[PDB]
DNA sequence: CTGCAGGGTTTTTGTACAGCCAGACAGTGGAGTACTACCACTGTGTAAGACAGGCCAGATC
């Protein structure tokens, strides 16, 4: 199933992470 | 269908290495900063009516 995602605005850094690692690569990529 | 209970799911939340840059700390001697009282001194209240006594005009007899 799966726990209710995230809002955004409430979080530390560290979900963030994962929430944009490939965004981040494909930027460096780029 | 409700109730709770093993675990699933994905995702949190942080600890784990190790290197490293930033800016704070602390000094200074005083700079010239910034914020402080202090000082006399101000601006906005704004127009009518009531009431007493005179006394002359003029109607009434």
Known sequence: GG???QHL???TRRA??????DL???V???
């Open 3 to 5: 726990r209710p995602r």
């Open 9 to 11: 605005l409430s979080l």
């Open 16 to 21: 963030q992470k994962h929430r944009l690692r």
């Open 24 to 26: 981040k690569n494909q």
């Open 28 to 30: 460096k990529t780029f």
